[PDB]
Amino acid sequence: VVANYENASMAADYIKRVSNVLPDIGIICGSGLGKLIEEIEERKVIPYINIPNFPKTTVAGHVGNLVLGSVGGRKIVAMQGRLHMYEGYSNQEIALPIRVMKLLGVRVLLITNLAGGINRKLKSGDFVLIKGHINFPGLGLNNVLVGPNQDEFGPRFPDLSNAYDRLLQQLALKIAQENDFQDLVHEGVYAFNGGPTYESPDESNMLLKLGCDVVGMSTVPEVIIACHCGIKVLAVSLIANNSILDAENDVSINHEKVLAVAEKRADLLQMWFKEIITRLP
Amino acid sequence: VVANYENASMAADYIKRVSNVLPDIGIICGSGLGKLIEEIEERKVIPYINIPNFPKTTVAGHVGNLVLGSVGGRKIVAMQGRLHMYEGYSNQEIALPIRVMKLLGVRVLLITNLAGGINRKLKSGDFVLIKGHINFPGLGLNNVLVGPNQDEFGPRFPDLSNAYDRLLQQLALKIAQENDFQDLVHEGVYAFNGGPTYESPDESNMLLKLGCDVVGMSTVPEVIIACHCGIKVLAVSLIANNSILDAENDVSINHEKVLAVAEKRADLLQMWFKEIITRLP
Amino acid sequence: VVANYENASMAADYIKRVSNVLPDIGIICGSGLGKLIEEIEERKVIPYINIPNFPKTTVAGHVGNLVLGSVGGRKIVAMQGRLHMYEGYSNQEIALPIRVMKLLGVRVLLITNLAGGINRKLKSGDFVLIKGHINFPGLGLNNVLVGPNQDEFGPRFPDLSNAYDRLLQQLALKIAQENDFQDLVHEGVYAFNGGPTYESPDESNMLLKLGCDVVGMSTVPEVIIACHCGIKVLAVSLIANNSILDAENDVSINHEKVLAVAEKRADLLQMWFKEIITRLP
Numbered sequence: 037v038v039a040n041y042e043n044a045s046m047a048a049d050y051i052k053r054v055s056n057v058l059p060d061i062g063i064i065c066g067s068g069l070g071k072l073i074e075e076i077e078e079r080k081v082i083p084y085i086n087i088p089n090f091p092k093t094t095v096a097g098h099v100g101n102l103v104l105g106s107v108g109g110r111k112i113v114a115m116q117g118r119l120h121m122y123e124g125y126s127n128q129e130i131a132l133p134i135r136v137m138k139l140l141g142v143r144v145l146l147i148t149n150l151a152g153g154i155n156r157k158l159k160s161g162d163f164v165l166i167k168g169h170i171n172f173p174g175l176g177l178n179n180v181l182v183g184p185n186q187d188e189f190g191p192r193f194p195d196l197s198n199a200y201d202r203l204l205q206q207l208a209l210k211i212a213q214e215n216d217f218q219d220l221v222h223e224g225v226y227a228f229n230g231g232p233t234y235e236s237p238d239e240s241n242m243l244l245k246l247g248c249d250v251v252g253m254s255t256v257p258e259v260i261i262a263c264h265c266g267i268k269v270l271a272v273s274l275i276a277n278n279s280i281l282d283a284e285n286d287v288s289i290n291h292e293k294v295l296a297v298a299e300k301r302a303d304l305l306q307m308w309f310k311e312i313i314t315r316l317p
Numbered sequence: 318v319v320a321n322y323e324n325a326s327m328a329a330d331y332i333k334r335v336s337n338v339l340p341d342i343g344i345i346c347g348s349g350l351g352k353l354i355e356e357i358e359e360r361k362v363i364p365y366i367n368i369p370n371f372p373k374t375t376v377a378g379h380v381g382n383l384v385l386g387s388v389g390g391r392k393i394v395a396m397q398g399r400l401h402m403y404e405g406y407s408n409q410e411i412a413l414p415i416r417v418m419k420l421l422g423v424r425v426l427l428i429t430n431l432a433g434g435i436n437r438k439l440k441s442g443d444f445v446l447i448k449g450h451i452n453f454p455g456l457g458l459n460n461v462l463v464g465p466n467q468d469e470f471g472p473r474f475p476d477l478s479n480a481y482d483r484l485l486q487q488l489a490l491k492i493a494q495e496n497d498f499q500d501l502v503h504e505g506v507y508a509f510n511g512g513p514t515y516e517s518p519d520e521s522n523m524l525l526k527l528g529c530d531v532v533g534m535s536t537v538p539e540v541i542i543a544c545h546c547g548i549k550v551l552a553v554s555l556i557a558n559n560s561i562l563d564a565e566n567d568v569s570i571n572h573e574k575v576l577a578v579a580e581k582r583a584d585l586l587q588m589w590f591k592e593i594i595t596r597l598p
Numbered sequence: 599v600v601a602n603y604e605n606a607s608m609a610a611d612y613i614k615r616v617s618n619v620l621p622d623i624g625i626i627c628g629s630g631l632g633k634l635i636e637e638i639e640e641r642k643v644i645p646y647i648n649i650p651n652f653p654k655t656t657v658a659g660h661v662g663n664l665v666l667g668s669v670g671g672r673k674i675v676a677m678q679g680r681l682h683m684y685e686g687y688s689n690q691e692i693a694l695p696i697r698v699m700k701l702l703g704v705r706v707l708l709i710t711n712l713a714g715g716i717n718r719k720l721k722s723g724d725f726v727l728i729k730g731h732i733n734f735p736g737l738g739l740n741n742v743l744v745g746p747n748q749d750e751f752g753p754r755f756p757d758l759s760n761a762y763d764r765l766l767q768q769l770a771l772k773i774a775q776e777n778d779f780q781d782l783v784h785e786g787v788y789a790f791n792g793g794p795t796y797e798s799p800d801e802s803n804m805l806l807k808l809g810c811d812v813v814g815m816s817t818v819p820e821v822i823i824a825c826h827c828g829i830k831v832l833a834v835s836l837i838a839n840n841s842i843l844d845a846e847n848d849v850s851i852n853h854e855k856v857l858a859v860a861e862k863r864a865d866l867l868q869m870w871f872k873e874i875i876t877r878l879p
């Protein structure tokens with residue numbers, strides 16, 4: 037199924053008939069960081085499997101729902117269960133839910149993820165406002181836009197220099213200051229590792245030489261589809277470790293350690309993003 | 318359809334029956350840089366769609382013709398409408414037209430493209446003689462030769478150290494000097510960005526660290542197929558902008574700005590390449 | 599055919615019925631470096647084409663056998679004819695033979711390859727104990743684990759920091775010292791070039807900047823599948839040339855020159871690895 041205008045239009049028609057909500061904000065929450073979705077008001081839960089033309093997610097399993105409702109007086113749509121390219125999904129499968137958001141009226145997309153720290157100033161538990169990226173799959177002929185261009189959504193050759201909205205970064209920082217946790221908040225460049233292996237010790241050292249501040253396996257595909265069709269983006273990484281220190285000390289990361297950091301910061305991130313949604317222009 | 322000996326042979330037989338031209342020079346012109354093809358003498362235009370085993374190009378649309386005839390007394394074949402890997406074409410689709418050129422008798426392939434400047438000495442409107450490349454798709458398992466080797470055309474493991482003929486670079490420079498535009502002409506290393514997004518500001522900074530002088534989304538796949546089967550190559554980039562300066566100043570590129578630079582240099586490039594064809598050994 | 603538990607189990611059942619050998623050591627030998635396999639004792643040769651669910655290898659051709667028997671009193675299984683991703687094999691085809699080794703009881707995998715030298719201390723004929731890697735395909739969305747995870751074999755997100763066992767590296771060095779060829783033996787980081795073109799002169803210079811010591815087109819996919827399912831690895835490169843010196847001097851490599859270096863070191867490598875097998879804990 038191609039992520040074209042006709043196919044996205046059929047999915048949007050179903051969603052509108054079932055939910056009665058017209059959202060102007062979309063959210064994609066990182067692993068272990070989804071508690072906000074369980075606080076959406078007057079909400080409607082829609083399994084992906086019920087939506088015409090949505091990608092099949094049963095091989096990977098686990099939760100996959102679209103959730104619509106209200107937060108802080110604002111109308112939102114959330115992806116509960118995000119799709120990752122290391123699972124084998126195609127370009128078209130990743131893009132179609134973002135283009136459905138566009139047709140539903142979304143103007144701003146808020147994203148969180150878990151990432152490894154490269155910059156020596158970053159420690160476990162820190163947050164990074166993403167200000168740019170290095171797309172290793174894109175340089176290497178695996179960009180999410182490889183294929184025919186879908187002209188109704190955007191141009192053949194997108195400019196990504198303003199993909200990460202500067203005013204949304206400022207608002208996120210302002211709220212952290214108001215609540216006295218600004219000592220946790222940095223800005224930085226995100227490296228997209230296709231995955232699913234964690235960067236090796238020598239890959240981490242290479243990323244440091246190339247000016248990367250953090251590394252993860254998500255986010256850049258959605259950002260590019262959103263920028264192509266004119267949706268503004270804020271993206272925030274939660275740092276689980278510093279891979280450069282780990283390489284110097286011969287220490288390892290694993291998924292268990294990552295999820296324990298997510299649990300330690302989940303409630304603060306939930307409150308932060310509730311206020312961001314409330315304050316959006 | 319595989320780019321094998323039998324399939325390329327059938328396409329070549331059709332072309333020979335229709336055109337009566339046996340070319341020893343091939344040309345592939347970059348976007349907005351195709352006016353020379355409209356000056357080919359006693360010419361024959363052959364739509365791709367008419368040629369057995371040529372790749373289907375109707376999803377992308379726009380022009381797709383093989384043009385045969387004479388320039389400066391020399392017999393040439395031109396691709397009018399080049400295939401780009403960011404459109405989703407396979408390795409086999411890109412390679413088959415180059416291998417048909419080989420079977421028709423082509424010994425020299427001349428290529429132009431539009432590119433972004435990385436080296437700080439490069440400005441909008443400059444020309445770069447390509448002397449080497451950095452193939453990000455090839456390091457990353459998307460080389461144009463991934464697949465069975467077609468032994469009739471070349472070896473399993475090609476050496477690319479002489480892919481860009483030094484004597485053709487010297488002849489191109491000599492002609493620029495004769496016409497007093499040598500102040501526009503540089504040499505440099507071409508980075509292959511799979512595309513279709515322009516390099517991000519932080520990707521540009523990374524390319525500078527790695528010794529890249531220019532960046533584009535074409536040319537390296539054709540160069541590798543030509544080198545594999547023993548065709549000599551000259552490749553020239555027209556620089557639309559300097560991406561490093563743009564990153565420092567928070568300024569953007571787009572396709573409209575690129576095509577306006579092409580229009581400004583098209584007539585000089587046309588005259589330059591007509592003389593190169595005339596003077597080839 | 600997916601590299602899942604059921605499919606690997608059927609291949610292992612066939613092998614056990616035919617060979618009567620239960621191996622705890624596996625070996626994969628590099629090109630021109632396979633003579634040890636012809637010295638396996640009380641051996642059984644099994645063509646790939648006879649084994650249920652083994653990948654089809656007839657397009658590439660040449661030898662493809664599983665060989666079981668005894669070396670130095672130890673029970674081993676060898677791949678005679680290794681699969682390379684530049685031939686077009688999928689992730690699933692590369693992984694299935696390694697997962698069959700796991701089900702047969704393999705606990706240690708020994709690997710050799712031919713590689714180009716990047717580090718200025720490396721010369722033709724030197725050996726490199728691999729201590730880490732830089733996986734360009736993996737950063738670029740062509741990791742061998744992209745796809746559904748096969749949970750019976752390993753975790754969704756593997757940690758590769760101990761992929762190259764330190765004690766096996768020490769044992770290999772100890773034996774070289776005992777036989778007074780330790781002046782040939784280095785350690786270093788392996789860059790995975792997807793291939794099949796040799797790294798270009800400007801790619802070599804880039805690899806030097808990024809901290810790579812050697813470059814090759816194999817080994818990293820098998821290492822990652824082995825690490826995922828808990829098999830210990832020793833991997834050794836035989837250096838055919840120094841690509842940085844060749845770039846400075848405008849000299850070329852080719853497959854003929856590579857195989858001549860393999861012939862010159864084959865007998866020493868055979869004796870070295872026989873002793874390693876004999877001495878394994």
Ligand SMILES: O=C1Nc2ccc(F)cc2[C@@H]1O
Nearest residue numbers: 150151152229252253276294
């Ligand atoms: O590539 C990755 N490395 C890494 C390390 C730690 C994390 F919490 C998350 C990731 C990223 O997905």
Ligand SMILES: O=C1Nc2ccc(F)cc2[C@@H]1O
Nearest residue numbers: 431432433510533534557575
């Ligand atoms: O990757 C690319 N960047 C870029 C920038 C400006 C151009 F005129 C052309 C391109 C290349 O196709």
Ligand SMILES: O=C1Nc2ccc(F)cc2[C@@H]1O
Nearest residue numbers: 712713714791814815838856
């Ligand atoms: O990528 C490669 N370069 C290279 C150079 C020389 C070799 F003997 C082997 C290789 C590797 O397969």
